[PDB]
Amino acid sequence: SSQIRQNYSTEVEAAVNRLVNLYLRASYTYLSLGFYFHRDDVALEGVCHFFRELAEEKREGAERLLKMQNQRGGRALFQDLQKPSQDEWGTTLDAMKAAIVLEKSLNQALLDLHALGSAQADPHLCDFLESHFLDEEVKLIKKMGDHLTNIQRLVGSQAGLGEYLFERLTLKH
Amino acid sequence: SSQIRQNYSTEVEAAVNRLVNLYLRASYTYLSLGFYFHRDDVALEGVCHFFRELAEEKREGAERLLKMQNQRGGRALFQDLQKPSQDEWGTTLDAMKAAIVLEKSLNQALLDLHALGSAQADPHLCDFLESHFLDEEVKLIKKMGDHLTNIQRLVGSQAGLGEYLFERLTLKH
Amino acid sequence: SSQIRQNYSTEVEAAVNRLVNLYLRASYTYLSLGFYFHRDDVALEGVCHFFRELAEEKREGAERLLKMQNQRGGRALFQDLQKPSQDEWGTTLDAMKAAIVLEKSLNQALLDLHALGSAQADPHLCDFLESHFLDEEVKLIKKMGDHLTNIQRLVGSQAGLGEYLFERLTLKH
Amino acid sequence: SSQIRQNYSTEVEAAVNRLVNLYLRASYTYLSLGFYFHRDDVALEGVCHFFRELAEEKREGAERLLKMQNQRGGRALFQDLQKPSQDEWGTTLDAMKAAIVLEKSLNQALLDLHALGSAQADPHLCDFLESHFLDEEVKLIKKMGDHLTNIQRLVGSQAGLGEYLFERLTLKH
Amino acid sequence: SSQIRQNYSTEVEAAVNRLVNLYLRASYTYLSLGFYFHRDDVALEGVCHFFRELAEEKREGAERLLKMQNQRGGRALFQDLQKPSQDEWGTTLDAMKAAIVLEKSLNQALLDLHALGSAQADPHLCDFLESHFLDEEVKLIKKMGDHLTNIQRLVGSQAGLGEYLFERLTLKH
Ligand SMILES: [Cl-]
Ligand SMILES: [Cl-]
Ligand SMILES: [Cl-]
Ligand SMILES: [Cl-]
Ligand SMILES: [Cl-]
Ligand SMILES: [Ir+4]
Ligand SMILES: [Ir+4]
Ligand SMILES: [Ir+4]
Ligand SMILES: [Ir+4]
Ligand SMILES: [Ir+4]
Ligand SMILES: [Ir+4]
Ligand SMILES: [Ir+4]
Ligand SMILES: [Ir+4]
Ligand SMILES: [Ir+4]
Ligand SMILES: [Ir+4]
Ligand SMILES: [Ir+4]
Ligand SMILES: [Ir+4]
Ligand SMILES: [Ir+4]
Ligand SMILES: [Ir+4]
Ligand SMILES: [Ir+4]
Questions:
Q1: Which of B6, B73, B127 sits opposite C107 (nearest CB)?
Q2: Separation between Cα atoms, residue D104 and residue D137, nearest integer Å
């Protein structure tokens, strides 16, 4: 409310609510990815666990944005959450490519919100993103890129072998 | 898949996916309730914590249904998640009345799914609900009813006093 | 005996004795599977251990049915135990396919006995199966389906390699 | 001195000395608030302790600015410290309203100094404020806003009762 | 200086300074190798760690030569450090072949310095090399030769598979 709010633009407030929606949508996408990889006809436990942990991380990012919205005196506003883009996610390679597309969209939204905060001279917002989001995102995208390279190296002429071995020897089970 | 699926009707599979959507919608409603009670112009920490814990419990119930869907060889299907019914939730009394309406709707959906499983002669489904959902729901609704009675006793002619005291002396902070 | 027996039909009593015979036959089949995979010309220790543990689990299921027969005042009656269907079990894939066929036959027998207990209004029998058998069976069939998918992914053009790797990196040795 | 000073404008140096004076004035105001609430005719121990802890926090903020002034090679310059604005502070509500006015003035001074550092291309100054001051201030103002809402809810028709209960059940004694 | 120097030829002093330059150049080459294998488009963590540890070992060898130069009363003289021979290092096989070429050049330089010390009748120099360098080098070259043989065995017709498996199952991650 107006009792605490100071230097917190309506533009930033609305963009924070939109970013919460993006993070919750990302969490829902990773929930779907995780359950897909634990199907009995997919059965890649390490892949399930990789995506189920990202579902939790994106939920936690949304909750940190909502706490910050309250700390600044803005008002959380929730919108409908669209379902994920696919019902079935293909191979581990297809899924990791979809994940890095999703993370680069989150990263661009973070960068756009940082730029709006810079333009609004809102240093608390800019520091909040720098401290809790921007490096987390760069680290995750680097990890996904490392995984993509290793998955791609393993396809060879024996795709099933390579998919098994990546899950067994890189991912956590 | 067809490799494991046995005695698991398409009707139950679809109703489980719908119930996952109801539980995730309930979780999203409790997320909104919790952040509303931590606004600086609402500021009831025990109420925030009560609803934020229910958001986590409803998420966990959705995840247990999704794991069971996979264990039976059905296929998780996600739909859009509608936003909660309100953006602002009024008093603790208004919020607890909305919560018990929400929980009785979840309970009726559980009872309806139990009845479908009974009709389909699916004892694993029926036991799953009895073991992980039906008593959890009766316990929670009893707790909410106890809270409603205590909140109602505290309104008197001093509503703000009563709301403070309930939060301080019943709810966990 | 007639001193304790109450609400325990002769139909359920006989079907419990038949199910004991099915579980003991299953145990004997898994004993044969385990010793086959420890032959020096087969030599897959993780596969031996997987099936030898199922031999013990099926024995224990038969013993829990026999204890329940006594607790209800029925009379255990033992029949001849037929030998397993094969003397040699082929590849790990062949053996896991035979195992899931065997487990779905046990599961159908459990479901049939639950339906008889339901028809006889024998809730102790129905609860006994729900509590100690039906979920154990769904969990095991899901595990076997996961293993089948992973074994099938590993066949590729290098079947021996895939069989080794599954035993080494999925099964316990 | 000139031996270490680099990228540290005379404008920032002077504004840091002014901000030290503001923080020390704030500390002196909170010292007065704390002793007022421990008068025998006021006697609100939790309120005394709340403000006496803020006196220490504002002192520590002044000392961190002075250490930074020295680390950058500027020169601390002290001015007279004006007495607090009141000798008696009224009710807990009056005192919490005066406190949030004081904290929003400190926050605006921090934001103004951040803007000067941005304009001077002094990233060490900007990071120093972001890291040790801006979030501390947003957190404190949110806490005070939460307290104001709870104090206001407790006034009702029984102001003394409400003041007692807030001190007893929210503030630390 | 002349206060301590005894039996320490100007020829050995100069050759020690040259060997320090060779060891520091080797360290810089291994730094480049390590960062190359942690690129997101290379992504072989065990290979990165193998070479980053050799960068540290070659630095430490240079520092032990410099300490000995001082202990004997010679004067350390540093020269420009040439950049490594490549900016990109190819496959793990290419990199391990370049590493063994580099180590055999260091070993030959050690042997040449031992021969100069022998010729100069400088037994402290000869013992220093025998005690801290010659066996370290033979051990490392044997390890690299073992790795080369294993990498070469893994190329087969599936080079990416083999590169992954070597990194996963031989190198430390
Ligand atoms: Cl959509
Ligand atoms: Cl809606
Ligand atoms: Cl037979
Ligand atoms: Cl004054
Ligand atoms: Cl060069
Ligand atoms: Ir910025
Ligand atoms: Ir490992
Ligand atoms: Ir993990
Ligand atoms: Ir039932
Ligand atoms: Ir209590
Ligand atoms: Ir709690
Ligand atoms: Ir039943
Ligand atoms: Ir393992
Ligand atoms: Ir085991
Ligand atoms: Ir800045
Ligand atoms: Ir308390
Ligand atoms: Ir305290
Ligand atoms: Ir020698
Ligand atoms: Ir090992
Ligand atoms: Ir290591």
A1: B6
A2: 8
Q: What is the DSSP letter of B81?
A: B
If one counts every other C-beta atom within 10 angstroms of the C-beta of residue C173, the result is: 12
How far CA B172 is from CA of B50, C112, D139, D164, in Å, comes to: 8, 49, 21, 21
Burial of E18 (0-12, 13-18, 19+ CB in 10 A): middle
Could you tell me if D163 and D92 are in contact, meaning their C-beta atoms sit under 8 angstroms apart?
A: yes
Asked if residue B161 is part of any domain, the answer here is: yes
DSSP state of B38: T
Q: Which amino acid is at C52?
A: R
Name which of B3, B39, B83 is nearest A78 (Cβ-Cβ).
Answer: B83
A137 is in an annotated binding site: no
**Cross-strand bridge partners of residue B81:** A81
Q: H helices within chain C, ranges in order?
A: 10-37, 45-72, 92-119, 123-129, 135-155, 159-169
Q: Distance between terminal CA atoms of chain B? A: 46
CA distance A131 to C69: 65
Is the CB of residue A169 less than 8 Å away from at least one CB of chain C? yes
Name the nearest CA neighbour of D140 among B49, A6, A63, B171: A6
The resolution, in angstroms to one decimal, equals: 1.2
Q: Is residue D5 a part of any domain in this protein?
A: no
| Identity of the amino acid at D157 | S
Interval between CA A2 and ligand 12 midpoint (Å): 59
Q: What contacts B43, CB < 8 A, 6 or more positions away?
A: B37, D145, D146, D147, D149, D150
Any domain includes E1: no
Centroid of ligand 13 to alpha carbon of A169 (angstroms): 8
Q: CA–CA separation, D100 vs B127, rounded Å?
A: 56
Query: Rounded to whole angstroms, what are the CA distances from E155 to A170, C37, C157?
Result: 20, 32, 18
Of the candidates C8, C3, C13, C26, the one whose C-alpha atom is nearest the C-alpha of residue C106 is C26
Q: CB A146: neighbour CB atoms within 10 A?
A: 19
Q: How was this structure determined?
A: X-ray
Cα–Cα distance list, E163 to C159, D173, E93, E153 (Å) = 21, 65, 8, 10
Which positions in chain B touch C114 (Cβ < 8 Å)?
A: 123
CA angle (C26 as vertex; C20, C30 as ends), nearest 5? 145
- CA torsion sign for E105, E109, E111, E112 is positive
Nearest-5° angle of CA A28, CA A34, CA A37? 145
Cβ within 8 Å, pair E164-A156: no
**Nearest by Cα to A162 from C170, C151, E37, E160:** E160
Residues making up chain A, counted from first to last: 173
- For every residue of chain E, DSSP letters joined together read -TTT--S--HHHHHHHHHHHHHHHHHHHHHHHHHHHHTSTTT--HHHHHHHHHHHHHHHHHHHHHHHHHHHHT--------PPPS-S---SHHHHHHHHHHHHHHHHHHHHHHHHHHHHTT-HHHHHHHIIIIIHHHHHHHHHHHHHHHHHHHHHTT-HHHHHHHHHHHTS--
Q: Are C124 and C72 in contact (CB under 8 A)?
A: yes
CATH code assigned at A79: 1.20.1260.10
Query: Which residue in chain D is spatially nearest to A73 when comparing CA positions?
Result: D142
Look up the domain containing A49 and give its range. 10-170
**Residue C145 structure tokens:** 């389906």
Quick check: is C5 in a domain? Answer: no
Residue D110: Cβ-neighbour burial (10 angstroms; 0-12, 13-18, 19+): buried
Give the Cα separation of D2 and A56 in Å (integer): 52
Q: How many domains is chain B partitioned into structurally? A: 1
- Point out the residue among C111, C139, C144 whose CB comes nearest to the CB of B7: C111
Residue E110 and residue E137 in contact, taking contact as beta carbons nearer than 8 Å:
yes
As a whole number of angstroms, the distance between CA B125 and CA D81 comes to 74
Asked if residue A60 belongs to a known ligand binding site, the reply is: yes
